[PDB]
Design a binder for this molecule. Structure first.
Ligand SMILES: OC[C@H]1O[C@@H](O[C@H]2[C@H](O)[C@H](O)[C@H](O[C@H]3[C@H](O)[C@H](O)[C@H](O[C@H]4[C@H](O)[C@H](O)[C@H](O[C@H]5[C@H](O)[C@H](O)[C@H](O[C@H]6[C@H](O)[C@H](O)[C@H](O)O[C@@H]6CO)O[C@@H]5CO)O[C@@H]4CO)O[C@@H]3CO)O[C@@H]2CO)[C@@H](O)[C@@H](O)[C@@H]1O
Ligand SMILES: [Mg+2]
Ligand SMILES: [Mg+2]
Length: 539
């Protein structure tokens, strides 16, 4: 049995049976595969807007189109093989050869990677996409050449990669239908080279079928670290000693923009004015109150996260002029203009030819707050005569629906999260390559096309000037508000609560040494630093 005071029980990110640890497919890999096992060149600290060199010792643009990366000495894979610049070169170059790899488009703007010396690389760009490069530095996991280099593309993309060999502080000890057990690598290079020493001997990542199940686990100290949404936080804190980021309401940091992606290839969702009608029909405040007990705030119409590094580009003129707000009369007005009228007194508008139509809205089953939220959204839409039914596929079906574009309306936040650049938000909304691609893992899940938007995304991407960025953000926001491929509704929380029954010194507002979120994508946003600060109450 695992000794209690050396074991960290964590959940909130495991919504399918653990079966994949492939760093090339983080959408399917067990959360923590990126972070615990495979590592990035840099972390990004969103609390302070700062990069922390991780595998890298340093990185800088030495010219308009050359980025010099210096790797730390003494880096090592979990199998003892040195991790070197060879592996970084390979991580990028494998995607030149194998276009099926998700980040293969990097080679449309990266020209070559020069080896300067033993630990230094010079990335030379044909098209220096500064904003997108920031994201690559924290999101691209470095993989071992000596393990992956002889695999075919099918092998690379399909491999379950059981017993993954990464360079990180934990490896996989065991797994089963309800858990993945990570075990500490006592020889992790980071101990010597960074002076970080992860405290848990084991991290047990738990799966539950619904947030409902996690409540009792946290209450009883069976769960230490929760990245679940849990209701009734005031009671958890008062009666069970639960800690959160903020001591008082709203308790939770914002994490991302939750909104509705719309299948623009399904009638009548193809009609931009119909999408604007839906936006006017929805009451985000009812969601904020009913689902979240005011732990979140409603989104501004552009969906720009209420953080300083984003809000410095807020397009107030554009939003004042082109924004939407909750107004059922305006929704009814537009629907009537479009000819969608109830001809049979069933409370549902038929189409202009008198035919019925109805739509689905979906979220993952067991994501209890999103279930309540899409019930609320559906109710709002039905109230102006749009027949919308909530559906709760399991996470895996939800994800296949999302990535494959097989939905009507879908509540999502996967690409609209906290990042090093506002470019990632607009890319997460508009991702042009989604349109012709079978699956999209990068955004624009409803496959909205707009050639003008593509040029603007690139303009923003290529800019390093605040004035220029502000100008382009305004143009992008105007098109977002006119065509609404994505309807922003609220900022979903960075859900974090912890039990102090075993582990203490959690990071909080007053002790902000890490952002304690272990969802995929968040280890590199300093989730990993959680592990070096927590303290086991008892030896
Ligand atoms: O409140 C509701 C419930 O919340 C639960 O917790 C949720 C949480 O709220 C949130 O939904 C979270 O979402 C995860 C998600 O599960 C998934 O892991 C997701 O993974 C993303 C990832 O963040 C990136 O967006 C990634 O984008 C990359 C692309 O895949 C691709 O590699 C791309 O490659 C480009 C390349 O880098 C280069 O730029 C080149 O030029 O072009 C390439 C192509 O574009 O690079 C992208 C960026 O790196 O995609 C994946 C998949 O979309 O990450 C989010 C965020 O964490 O999930 C959790 C649950 O796990 C619970 O709290 C529950 O209790 C609540 O009820
Ligand atoms: Mg307290
Ligand atoms: Mg009718």
């Amino acid at each position: 049995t695992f000794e209690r005071n050396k074991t960290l029980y964590w959940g909130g990110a495991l919504w399918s049976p653990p079966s994949n640890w492939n760093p090339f497919t983080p959408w399917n890999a067990v959360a923590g595969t990126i972070g615990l096992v495979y590592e990035p060149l840099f972390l990004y600290d969103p609390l302070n807007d700062k990069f922390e060199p991780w595998l890298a010792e340093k990185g800088e643009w030495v010219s308009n189109n050359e980025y010099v990366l210096t790797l730390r000495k003494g880096l090592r894979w979990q199998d003892g093989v040195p991790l070197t610049a060879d592996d970084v070169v390979f991580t990028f170059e494998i995607a030149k050869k194998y276009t099926g790899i998700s980040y293969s488009p990097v080679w449309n703007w990266l020209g070559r990677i020069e080896r300067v010396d033993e630990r230094t690389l010079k990335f030379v760009f044909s098209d220096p996409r500064y904003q997108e490069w920031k994201q690559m530095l924290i999101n691209t996991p470095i993989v071992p050449k000596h393990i992956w280099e002889n695999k075919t593309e099918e092998e690379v993309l399909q491999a379950a990669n059981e017993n993954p060999v990464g360079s990180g502080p934990y490896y996989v000890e065991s797994w089963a239908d309800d858990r993945c057990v990570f075990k500490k690598n006592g020889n992790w290079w980071g101990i010597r080279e960074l002076g970080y020493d992860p405290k848990p001997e084991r991290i047990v990542e738990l799966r539950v079928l619904s947030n409902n199940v996690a409540v009792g686990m946290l209450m009883k100290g069976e769960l230490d670290w929760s990245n679940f949404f849990l209701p009734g936080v005031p009671v958890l804190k008062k009666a069970y000693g639960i800690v959160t980021w903020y001591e008082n309401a709203p308790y939770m940091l914002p994490a991302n923009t939750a909104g509705i992606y719309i299948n623009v290839n399904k009638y009548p969702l193809s009609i931009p004015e119909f999408r604007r009608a839906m936006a006017y029909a929805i009451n985000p405040e009812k969601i904020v109150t009913r689902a979240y007990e005011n732990m979140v705030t409603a989104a501004n119409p552009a969906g720009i996260l209420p953080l300083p590094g984003y809000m410095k580009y807020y397009p107030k003129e554009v939003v004042d002029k082109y924004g939407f707000k909750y107004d059922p009369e305006m929704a009814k007005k537009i629907l009537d203009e479009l000819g969608f009228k109830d001809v049979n007194k069933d409370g549902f508008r038929e189409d202009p030819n008198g035919k019925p139509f109805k739509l689905t809205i979906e979220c993952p089953y067991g994501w209890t707050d999103w279930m309540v939220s899409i019930q609320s959204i559906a109710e709002d839409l039905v109230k102006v005569g749009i027949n919308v039914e909530p559906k709760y596929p399991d996470y895996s079906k939800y994800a296949d629906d999302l990535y494959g574009g097989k939905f009507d309306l879908i509540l999502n936040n996967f690409t609209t999260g906290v990042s090093a650049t506002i470019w990632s938000y607009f890319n997460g909304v508009f991702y042009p390559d989604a349109v012709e691609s079978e699956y999209s893992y990068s955004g624009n899940f409803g496959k909205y096309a707009n050639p003008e938007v593509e040029t603007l995304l690139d303009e923003l991407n290529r800019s390093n000037d605040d004035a220029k960025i502000k100008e382009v953000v305004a143009k992008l926001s105007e098109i977002l508000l006119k065509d609404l491929p994505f309807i922003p509704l609220w900022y979903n929380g960075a859900w974090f609560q912890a039990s102090e029954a075993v582990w203490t010194n959690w990071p909080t507002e007053k002790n902000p040494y890490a952002v304690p979120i272990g969802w995929n994508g968040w280890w590199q946003l300093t989730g990993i630093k959680t592990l070096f600060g927590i303290e086991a109450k008892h030896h």
